[PDB]
């Protein structure tokens, strides 16, 4: 699965996630209580005048004074006597009318005289009403200015606290994501270092590099999305529903019903956008590949007058991709944005319908404060829907990348090792009896038998595939022979740590593997244990080029060209120097500068001689002239050592080596 491993990696670094969740919850609570401040500020202060007023003497503060008498509300009122002398400030049209006595229900109110009759279902009574001046109405509004101020200040304080906590919870979510991905990358790279070379051979470098880095960035994006778009929104939708239910239970069921709308819309949009985005991506990749192969290969396209057919295919791809772009545009418009706005308008219609039904029932109105809070909570709710559906549709690529990474991490086959060597072996290596097949059946080594004594320069000669690079692979335990035995000194290769084995022996393959950095970075591979490389390198005949290449002292940093900064001969020189630095007992030489169409033989033979001394050099040089001074010439007849002996001994028999040497020398 994918969720299981993602959750397992998320449980690591749980303190950060829990802190982020809690800070998000606190900030959410502050933000959502804001609109409750708004509702209270509307109802209790702006709409407080409508509440009943009771007449009282000039004894209590906040008791508003009208004409010669002073009244005070039913809330900012101590209780000397409730009695029955009640006065109201009714509203009809845009006018506020003062009623000095009113004990009855409230309904539709009209004024043609001082009657201020209330109709409701049927007319009940008419009360002598008086119009209130603008200043008098304010006097009836003044007592609530201080509550206004306090609610505003509370609203600002909660705002700043929410600011701080939002910043904190976002920073912690991102820190958690980046720490998890760093852990994943470290683990994947370690596994790569503990992977068999067989896996490396089949897959190209690009695929494994992608698995290490690009897929883990996809995981990063997934964690960011799930954290900062689904958990946050879930906690932002739970709090909103809590507030709405605290406001009005009956209406909130409308939003409980809205949730299925979100579910169905996301499902449909995913179903269609997956198809359209897949086709768009597949055709855009085809367009880019066609463009690349047309630029790369333009000459013959023009020479053979194929400019009227390649353009036709390119236009087919372009038209298809454009058509799918149009279809995606149609779906995107319809499903996303016109729908968000339509649902918002439907919510407004539902608000009006519900509150109107309430207000038509004997003028029993649910506070307009509830309406404002609902309008402020529903505007909040609809903001993140489009992003939610987009991410829900887009999760599939991250899912695939996660699958690839977690299949790499779960590969059972591995190489367990990591123990260096203890003492130098002086260079004894033998192949008493071995047989190697890469996969099955096809044998590249058949009953190979040789014993390379302390005598060095044991050479393998062949061409077009006989099992020499197979011998090299067997020597370093890159591939296991699955049959026979191999020994260095008296020990068996298959009875010791890989690091110990490879600690005895060096290697310089055909292409000198140059690493970005300084020259000293190459000679020591950034070992940091060996101190003096130049001085030792001074004995390796590298005293000319480094002086030419500026003033390296191991600080040149020239390899930024990936190797092109130097010459091929210089690259082989540095490879030989690195091999000499570690001073391995054995030195397995592949085709080193003897690759193709080359004449500068002495230029590298001079270093080859310097590295020859005091080792057991296994050389697979194809140029038999350079190997004539070898001691144990080995000829591979497609998996068999048909002949054995020095160059003179092989020449006398004239089986295959004499003929090959004659051809190679005479042709020159």
């Amino acid at each position: 699965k994918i969720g299981k491993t993602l959750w397992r990696y998320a449980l690591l670094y749980r303190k950060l996630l829990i802190t982020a969740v809690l800070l998000l919850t606190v900030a959410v609570g502050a933000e959502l209580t804001g609109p409750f401040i708004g509702k209270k500020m509307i109802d209790d202060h702006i709409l407080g005048i409508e509440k009943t007023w009771y007449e009282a003497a000039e004894k209590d503060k906040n008791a508003v004074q009208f004409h010669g008498v002073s009244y005070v509300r039913e809330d900012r009122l101590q209780e000397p006597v409730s009695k029955a002398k009640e006065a109201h400030i009714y509203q009809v049209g845009m006018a506020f009318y003062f009623v000095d006595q009113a004990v009855s229900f409230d309904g539709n109110r009209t004024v043609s005289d001082g009657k201020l009759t209330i109709t409701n279902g049927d007319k009940s009574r008419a009360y002598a009403a008086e119009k209130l001046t603008k200043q008098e109405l304010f006097q009836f509004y003044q007592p609530e200015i201080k509550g206004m101020v306090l609610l505003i200040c509370l609203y600002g304080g909660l705002l700043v606290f929410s600011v701080f906590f939002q910043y904190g919870q976002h920073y912690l979510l991102q820190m958690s994501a980046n720490r998890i991905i760093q852990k994943m990358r470290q683990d994947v790279f370690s596994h790569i270092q503990k992977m068999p070379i067989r896996y490396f051979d089949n897959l190209p470098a690009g695929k494994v590099v992608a698995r290490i880095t690009n897929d883990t960035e996809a995981i990063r994006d997934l964690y960011v999305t799930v954290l900062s778009t689904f958990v946050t929104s879930g906690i932002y939708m739970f709090g909103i529903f809590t507030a709405l239910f605290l406001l009005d239970v009956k209406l909130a069921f409308v939003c409980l019903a809205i949730v299925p709308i979100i579910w169905l819309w996301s499902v449909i949009y995913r179903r269609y956008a997956s198809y359209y985005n897949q086709k768009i991506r597949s055709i855009n990749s085809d367009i880019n590949a066609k463009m690349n192969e047309s630029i790369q290969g333009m000459t013959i396209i023009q020479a053979f007058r194929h400019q009227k057919e390649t353009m036709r295919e390119f236009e087919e791809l372009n038209e298809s991709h454009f058509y799918f772009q149009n279809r995606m545009l149609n779906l995107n418009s319809l499903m996303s944005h016109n729908l968000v706005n339509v649902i918002r308008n439907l919510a407004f219609v539902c608000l009006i319908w519900h509150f109107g039904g309430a207000s038509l029932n004997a003028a029993g109105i649910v506070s307009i404060g509830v309406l404002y809070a609902f309008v402020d909570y529903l505007n909040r709710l609809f903001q993140p829907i489009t992003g939610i559906v987009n991410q829900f549709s887009k999760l599939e690529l991250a899912r695939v990348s996660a699958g690839r990474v977690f299949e790499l991490l779960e590969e059972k086959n591995t190489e367990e090792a990591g123990e260096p060597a203890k003492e130098r072996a002086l260079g004894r290596v033998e192949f008493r009896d071995v047989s190697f097949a890469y996969q099955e059946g096809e044998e590249v080594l058949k009953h190979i038998s040789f014993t390379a004594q302390k005598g060095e320069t044991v050479a393998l000669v062949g061409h077009t595939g006989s099992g020499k690079s197979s011998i090299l692979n067997l020597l370093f335990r890159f591939y296991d022979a699955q049959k026979g035995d191999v020994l260095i000194d008296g020990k068996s290769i298959y009875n010791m740590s890989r690091q110990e084995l490879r600690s005895h022996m060096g290697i310089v393959l055909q292409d000198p593997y140059l690493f970005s950095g300084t020259i000293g970075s190459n000679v020591s591979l950034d070992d940091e244990r060996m101190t003096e490389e130049e001085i030792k390198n001074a004995l390796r005949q590298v005293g000319a080029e480094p002086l030419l290449k500026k003033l390296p002292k191991g600080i040149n940093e020239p390899v930024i060209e990936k190797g092109s900064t130097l010459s091929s001969g210089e690259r082989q020189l540095i490879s030989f120097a690195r091999a000499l630095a570690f001073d391995p007992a054995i030195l397995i030489l592949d085709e080193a500068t003897a690759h193709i169409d080359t004449e500068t033989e002495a230029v590298i033979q001079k270093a080859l001689d310097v590295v020859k001394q005091g080792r057991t050099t296994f050389v697979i040089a194809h140029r038999l002239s350079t190997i004539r001074n070898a001691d144990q010439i080995l000829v591979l007849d497609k998996g068999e050592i048909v002949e054995r002996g020095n160059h003179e001994e092989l020449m006398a028999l004239e089986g295959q080596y004499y003929q090959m040497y004659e051809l190679q020398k005479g042709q020159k």
């Binding site: 760093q182 470290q186 390649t310 706005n341 509150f355 038509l360 404002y372 290697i507 970005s516 690195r578």
Partner: protein
């Protein structure tokens, strides 16, 4: 904006669609101001003692009507505008691909494939986004913003709107600053990740050395250091990324708070109403977006300007290197002759080719050879119209090639590039570039002529497999033989075989050469190679050293003198085999 001015051709081409889009955009923007005001009016009619089922039904019906309206008009203007953006994408694709199909080698020498692919994959996207979304944002920042501002000013109040709007400009400025400063750190973090990618590739390609010097732990150490650096850069980016939500939340909560509080202090003074206090809230809620639209516009306009400037530089700034003129009426080539062809290779100070007085008569199989780097391939690159004519003359029976139309000359020459340049198509289709009208039998005839029938037989007959993507059984010799098969299928008057067969066996090369000269002796042929066996029978052999010719004699005359006795050298190779 400059990008919009430079895109004048596109807009003039498509004016009905874009004018419809703009008109519908403005109509929807104006219609959208009604819902909030109708909600405020409903609230007011609720508070005042006048609200009947008639009015409520009126409000529900009008809301539904406006909803359906804005829905349909939204669909149609979005369709028109974004379909226009897609059409611009298509137009730029066609233009770029056609121009590239027109261009010649020097243009590709001056411009790397990376820039061309970036232009064909990035700048087109930027320009299309300009055309559609930048226009949308211009209409959102110039018409929706001012419409909302003046609607709030007139239909609500002119002090509440002024007070409850101050934080929005500050929010826009802060958003722009945070965008710039986060993009900088994002570039830094992407640079660090690229370094990580390079190191991982370097330590997964050269794994043999790493594991054969037991350095697979210092490698882990270096990777851990660079992963830590990537994480640190990613934290530095986050430090500025996390400021976008707090700032907008603060400067929108301040706006809402000012609106609500200062509407409360106005409802007290009787300069507003609850419905007008609810509609103002909704208007601010819908106004919070033009603030982002301003920044998105100022960004997309400049990005599109740069991308369109690059697209024009690749498209128009570059002229075709070689062009035809009044085409002389020559039906076939006669006796190709070079009088004094002193070609100065572009991007090369040295002449690289001095005067060459060599003439090839109809059917006179020529053959060229010499030291590597002797400029023996420049002959055919002169014969192929690839590069500028330079100084000299190449007359096809008195009419210089610079006069014959490019199409006819291309029809005459059967070109076989030395570098195998096959395409990722079926082998059969790969062989049909020379003749697209082949009836599938001359294909087999030419395959036999190239002796490719036997080697093609072993390959699975799955539509002759595919070469470029992954050769089922492919080798250099096979690619040379298929290229020769294409050239033969072209049935050309002048056959150019540059490094004809440097991969196939000597016997196979000799057999193919004999076959070609057998069925095309009456037609001219050019042979360039290092192995003198291929030009053994040619009746005009020029050996080129440096940038000039040495001897114009036949093979017997060439072997008579020892100025270039590589033939004697390979005679031992002939003895060696």
């Amino acid at each position: 904006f400059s990008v919009l001015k430079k895109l004048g051709w596109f807009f003039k081409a498509y004016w009905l669609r874009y004018t419809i889009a703009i008109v519908l955009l403005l109509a929807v923007n104006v219609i959208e101001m009604f819902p909030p005001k109708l909600l405020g009016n409903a609230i007011d009619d609720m508070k005042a003692g006048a609200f009947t089922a008639e009015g409520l039904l009126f409000y529900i019906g009008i809301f539904f009507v406006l909803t359906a309206a804005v829905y349909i008009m939204s669909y149609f203007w979005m369709h028109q505008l974004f379909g226009g953006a897609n059409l611009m994408e298509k137009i730029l694709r066609t233009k770029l691909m056609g121009h590239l199909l027109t261009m010649s080698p020097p243009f590709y020498e001056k411009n790397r494939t990376g820039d061309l692919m970036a232009r064909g994959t990035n700048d087109l996207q930027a320009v299309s986004l300009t055309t559609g979304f930048g226009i949308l944002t211009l209409v959102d920042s110039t018409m929706f913003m001012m419409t909302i501002f003046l609607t709030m000013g007139f239909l609500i109040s002119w002090k509440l709107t002024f007070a409850a709007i101050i934080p929005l400009p500050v929010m826009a400025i802060a958003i722009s600053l945070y965008g710039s400063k986060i993009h900088e750190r994002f570039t830094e973090a992407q640079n660090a990740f690229g370094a990580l990618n390079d190191r991982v590739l370097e330590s997964v390609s050269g794994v043999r050395v790493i594991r054969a010097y037991v350095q697979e732990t210092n490698d882990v150490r270096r990777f851990n250091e660079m992963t830590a650096d990537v994480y640190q850069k990613n934290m530095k980016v986050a430090f500025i990324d996390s400021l976008f939500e707090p700032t907008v939340k603060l400067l929108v909560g301040a706006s809402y708070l000012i609106g609500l509080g200062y509407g409360a202090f106005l409802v007290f003074r009787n300069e507003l109403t609850l419905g007008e206090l609810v509609s103002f809230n909704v208007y601010l809620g819908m106004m919070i977006w033009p603030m982002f639209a301003i920044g998105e516009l100022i960004n997309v306009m400049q990005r599109g300007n740069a991308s369109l400037d690059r697209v024009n530089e690749t498209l128009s700034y570059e002229t075709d290197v070689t062009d035809p003129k009044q085409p002389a009426d020559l039906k076939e080539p006669g006796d190709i002759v070079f009088s004094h062809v002193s070609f100065t290779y572009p991007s090369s100070t040295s002449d690289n080719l001095q005067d060459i007085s060599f003439t090839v008569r109809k059917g006179q199989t020529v053959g060229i050879a010499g030291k590597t780097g002797s400029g023996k391939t420049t002959i055919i690159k002169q014969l192929l119209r690839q590069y500028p004519p330079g100084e000299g003359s190449i007359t096809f029976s008195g009419v210089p090639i610079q006069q014959i139309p490019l199409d006819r000359l291309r029809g005459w020459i059967g070109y076989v590039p030395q570098d195998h340049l096959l395409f990722s198509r079926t082998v059969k289709e790969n062989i049909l570039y020379g003749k697209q009208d082949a009836t599938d039998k001359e294909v087999q005839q030419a395959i036999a002529e190239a002796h490719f029938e036997k080697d093609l037989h072993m390959l699975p007959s799955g539509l002759e497999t595919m070469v470029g993507e992954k050769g089922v059984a492919l080798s250099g010799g096979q690619k040379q033989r298929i290229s020769i098969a294409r050239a033969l299928m072209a049935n050309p008057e002048i056959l150019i075989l540059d490094d004809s067969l440097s991969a196939v066996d000597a016997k196979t090369e000799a057999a193919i050469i004999k076959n070609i000269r057998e069925n095309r002796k009456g037609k001219t042929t050019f042979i360039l190679t290092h192995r003198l066996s291929a030009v053994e029978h040619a009746d005009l052999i020029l050996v080129m050293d440096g940038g000039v010719i040495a001897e114009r004699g036949t093979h017997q005359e060439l072997l008579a003198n020892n100025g270039w006795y590589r033939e004697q050298y390979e005679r031992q190779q002939l003895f060696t085999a």
